[PDB]
Design a protein around this ligand. Sequence first.
Ligand SMILES: [N-]=[N+]=NCCCCCCCCN1[C@@H]2[C@H](C(=O)O)[C@@H](O)[C@H](O)[C@@H](O)[C@@H]21
Ligand SMILES: [Cl-]
Length: 458
Amino acid sequence: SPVRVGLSVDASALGHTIPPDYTGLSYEQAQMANPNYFSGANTQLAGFLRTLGRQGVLRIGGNTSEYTFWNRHAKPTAADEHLAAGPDKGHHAAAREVITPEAVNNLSEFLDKTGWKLIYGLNLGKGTPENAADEAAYVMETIGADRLLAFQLGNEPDLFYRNGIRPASYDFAAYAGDWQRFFTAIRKRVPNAPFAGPDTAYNTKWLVPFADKFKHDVKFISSHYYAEGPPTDPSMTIERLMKPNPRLLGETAGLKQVEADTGLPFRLTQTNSCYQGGKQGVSDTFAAALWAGDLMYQQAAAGSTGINFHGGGYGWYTPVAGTPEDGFIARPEYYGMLLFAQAGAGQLLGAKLTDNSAAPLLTAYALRGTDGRTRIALFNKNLDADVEVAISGVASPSGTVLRLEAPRADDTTDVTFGGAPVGASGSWSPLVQEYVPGHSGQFVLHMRKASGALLEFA
Ligand SMILES: [N-]=[N+]=NCCCCCCCCN1[C@@H]2[C@H](C(=O)O)[C@@H](O)[C@H](O)[C@@H](O)[C@@H]21
Ligand SMILES: [Cl-]
């Protein structure tokens, strides 16, 4: 029988306001070697992005950003015209790639088709300041100030000391000197170039020193998050993925403190469940939908300006999989992002759970929509417990529910939202209508184990 929990919504308990460009995706820079991928001709992928949000941010970076070499006279290889660059697996050095004017031109058209903004990595790991300045100038020329949100100078510079990009002694002080050299060169070509950083993988010690040094030179602070811990941890499981992550909480507190010290907001510019491209049986499953949707809300509630789920190719954790030649599909994680998209923007409200110790991985978020209607996003991440949620603090004549479902937490397919899969080119509309039982001030929602729900009140 279900665990009977209470949820009290408090319309006076005002949280953060979710911005319209919160959602986003991250891709490997190597993908820019193929001018057909981020292209106005890529209508399938553009549709998948639009379904994730009418505003949002595309970030391009990752390990391959140290292996991409812009040149104004470059041409893609024949193989480049067909490249599908999935998440770098981190086992050895990435292949060298060139980036061309054509690809940047086509990226511009892709951003126009999607309505999304751009965070663009520059090659601080192996490239030169002058080449970065030239690349930045072309990007600014072509993409424009309104769509270019920030350049980033290197990806995960806190890992250069161990991945061959720099010697073992590389540290924040060394990075700060590299950053300044690149910044100076770029600003000579592009005096209005916007920056974010430090784009770190994990090392929270770099946040303070970076922000204090470069606070007048950046628009926002960026860092990364993977749910999987260090290599010496036990292998990630779905059970672990559903549970709170104290490292996340600490990282988020570090970022909040930077904002308190400097005024700079923060964005989680690369995230996913498990590293090395993901873990088959965890990252590519329905549990990842629950994980991702919940993470989006947790971070929004903490004051993040947005998020960018890493992906590409057919990587285990990619939200969207596919290629221009074979087409694109929504993977399970996409459906958690879709729940967020459908909820929309607005101000988060207090949403306190009680009587929930037997269903501790249920999370709930309440929102006053931009349209004035109350929504509640719930993630029943308990893998073995169904819940019955008694909802107080909401007065409405009618509420509806859209369910986020799969038959098993580990399913790699069979994921639906609102009773429907996402179709080709991101097409989605709900096919199952359900009213929330109960009435004004006392609604009652059942949720099966390992499921999610979006409630909308009239
Ligand atoms: N503690 N400690 N240090 C050990 C390092 C572990 C932390 C992150 C390592 C994996 C990061 N690695 C993430 C990703 C992946 O491995 O899936 C890959 O595709 C992207 O290109 C990278 O930017 C980033
Ligand atoms: Cl806060």
